[PDB]
Design a protein around this nucleic acid. Structure first.
Lengths: 15, 84, 177, 220, 63, 39
RNA sequence: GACCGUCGUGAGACAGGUUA
RNA sequence: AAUACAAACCAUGAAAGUGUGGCCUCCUUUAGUCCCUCGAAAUUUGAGGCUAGAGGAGAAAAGUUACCACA
């Protein structure tokens, strides 16, 4: 899928 | 804060903080192997605990006393089941 | 394929010399130079010649089953066992010999212990717990065992008592058929 | 090289934990519990309350520590927290309550001392800035640098910081492995329990102009 | 003293971790051997010589 | 400082009765086992 | 009959056992 | 609960109506290619190769038994 999690912002974003 | 309905609910409040550290632990574990470090302590790492060993000895004794009380009370049940 | 190790040959020669008197005669340089070198396989020891070992070391370990004549096997605890397979070696150069009669050899070959009525004649200077080899009237090698008591105590005990404790006999030959 | 960090880029951090002159055994045990977890910190005790706040700065400059965690005790009953970047950086003040220490035999969790934690933050620690400043100060105080030679390597605990009412609740749990049925992480809680209510943000080291004021704080 | 295995007590994260494994861990030869093992049988005969003198304890019984 | 020459064994103040059977004593920061310098 | 034993463990024995 | 179908809902369009949520998953046991090689066999088979259904810290000693003796 085109979605991973950002640890330093705590959101979901695409590749 | 949306997970906690009432702040005096000790069961739900403990579960909310536990649930928060749950997905933090699983997500951190996944990212830590992708980079790759030794994550899990092996059977041979006799390393020094944050707690005194004797503290774990008395907490092991307390878990004995609570669990042995439950089953000894069940033996008291079976004696009085014979009574009725 | 391997030979006897240090402790493993020590216990083997400990239990052998408890029943053997001339270990030098059994393993010695012969006329041709061939030697009676020990051998083990699948935790079971054997007594072979060296030239037998050369024509048997060419074989994969799992395909070989036995080699020469067998002496015994080792348990999980590590103690040694000597079998009735080692009897022709054992009876050849025996230290202490006990002869039992035909009416007493039949319970001996069945699996019963040795009684004072079973024995015909006796050897001398036999200690309490020393090993011995059991023969008949016709010097046929029957078995081996450890006596219950010494020679003098056997004279003064009841004839119905147990004399020499029966360890092995020809029943293993009848069992394996 | 003197900062004992074996890493590609060194995270040079040090903390200095301190105590006031009137703390309790419950506040004293939180020194011992936090400093045991915190591998790049020094313990010091009994700072004079008759001194000034900025004498906590050259106390830390004496020991080469850019962070300071001060336990200040008032009345012999109340714990007050202070997190601060020592030379010129921002500081914070909390009121700490609902204390439960590692010595109490009811947590049933344990971990290596000096092992690296995972920092489990909250969602409001990102969106609202007064939580964001203390977020970086929490992250620096529990920074535990990469190549620190006093740190035990295997990771087995996670520190959870969450805000519920207006107050931050700390949690510590042990990472344990139980195999999945045809291994998942099960958390057993280890150590300190306290509730952390913000009071101020000051733009100086220990004085400096006031930046946040919590105008809902009921003092004891 | 009731057994732990049936007892509902989880493992504890002491200094010993969860799950601890135990550590992995000649002509003259014939000569010394015979001598040593015969020397043991010779010792048996000596204890048996005190049993040949134990017939005096059996005689003392009768007397 | 007290923590200047910090040792590499990554061990605690645990008694040396442990690590007396396994061939390695302690680990390091990366995680490589440390096998005893003298036997 | 049922135990404390002593002597051996590949199996066993006892004028040794608290009274006259 | 999944799945099938129907209805509701939703997206667009002014209306008319339209519209939607893929295809796969080293040896041991087994079958086939009767394909190739080596043989046998007065013409048919045997053994290998190949293909495809499924399994898997080391010499210090371990695992297990409606088993034996002892406590």
């Amino acid at each position: 899928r085109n979605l991973q999690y950002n640890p330093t912002t705590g959101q979901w974003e695409r590749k | 804060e949306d997970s906690i309905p009432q702040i005096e609910d000790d069961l739900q409040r403990e579960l909310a903080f536990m649930n928060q550290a749950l997905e933090a632990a699983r997500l951190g574990r996944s990212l830590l192997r992708k980079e790759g470090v030794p994550f899990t302590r092996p059977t041979d790492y006799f390393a020094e605990m944050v707690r005194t060993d004797a503290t774990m000895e008395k907490v092991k004794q307390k878990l004995i006393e609570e669990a042995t009380a439950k089953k000894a009370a069940a033996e008291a049940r079976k004696q009085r089941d014979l009574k009725k | 394929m391997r030979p006897l190790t240090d402790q493993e040959m020590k216990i083997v020669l400990d239990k052998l010399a408890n029943y053997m008197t001339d270990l030098k005669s059994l393993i010695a340089p012969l006329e041709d130079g061939d030697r009676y070198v020990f051998r083990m396989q699948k935790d079971r020891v054997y007594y072979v010649k060296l030239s037998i070992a050369n024509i048997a070391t060419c074989v994969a370990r799992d395909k070989l089953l036995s080699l020469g004549t067998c002496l015994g096997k080792m348990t999980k605890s590590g103690k040694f066992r000597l079998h009735i397979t080692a009897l022709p070696i054992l009876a050849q150069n025996a230290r202490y010999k006990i002869w039992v009669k035909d009416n007493g050899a039949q319970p001996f070959l069945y699996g019963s212990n040795i009684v004072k009525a079973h024995v015909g004649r006796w050897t001398e200077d036999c200690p309490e717990h020393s090993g011995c080899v059991v023969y008949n009237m016709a010097d046929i090698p029957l078995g081996f065992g450890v006596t219950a008591r010494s020679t003098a105590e056997a004279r003064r005990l009841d004839p119905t008592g147990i004399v020499c404790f029966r360890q092995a006999d020809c029943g293993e030959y009848l069992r394996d058929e | 090289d003197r900062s004992n960090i074996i890493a590609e880029r060194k995270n040079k951090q040090r903390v200095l934990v301190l105590s006031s002159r009137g703390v309790t055994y419950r506040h004293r045990h939180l020194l011992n519990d936090l400093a045991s977890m915190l591998p790049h910190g020094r313990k010091d005790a009994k700072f004079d309350t008759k001194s000034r706040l900025y004498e906590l700065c050259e106390l830390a400059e004496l020991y080469n520590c850019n962070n300071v965690l001060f336990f200040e005790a008032r009345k012999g009953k109340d714990l007050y927290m202070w997190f601060s970047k020592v030379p010129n950086g921002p500081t914070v003040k909390f009121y700490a309550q609902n204390l439960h220490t590692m010595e109490e035999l009811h947590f049933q969790g344990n971990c290596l001392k000096g092992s690296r934690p995972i920092l489990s933050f909250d969602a409001a620690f990102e969106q609202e800035p007064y939580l964001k400043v203390i977020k970086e100060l929490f992250l620096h105080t529990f920074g535990v640098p990469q190549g620190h030679k006093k740190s035990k390597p295997f990771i087995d605990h996670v520190l959870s910081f969450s805000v519920a009412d207006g107050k931050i609740w700390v949690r510590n749990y042990e990472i344990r492995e139980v195999e999945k049925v045809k291994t998942d992480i099960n958390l057993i809680e280890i150590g300190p329990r306290f509730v952390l209510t913000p009071i101020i943000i000051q733009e100086g080291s220990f004085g400096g102009p006031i930046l946040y004021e919590n105008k809902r704080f009921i003092s004891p | 003293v009731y057994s732990e295995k049936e007892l509902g007590i989880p493992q504890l994260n002491t200094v010993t971790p969860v799950g601890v494994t135990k550590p992995k861990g000649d002509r003259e030869s014939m000569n010394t051997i015979l001598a040593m093992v015969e020397a043991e049988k010779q010792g048996q005969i000596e204890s048996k010589i005190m049993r040949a003198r134990q017939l005096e304890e059996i005689r003392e019984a009768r007397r | 400082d007290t923590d200047y020459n910090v040792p590499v064994n990554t061990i605690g103040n645990i008694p040396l009765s442990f690590y007396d059977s396994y061939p390695h004593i302690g680990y390091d920061i990366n995680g490589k086992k440390i096998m005893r310098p003298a036997t």
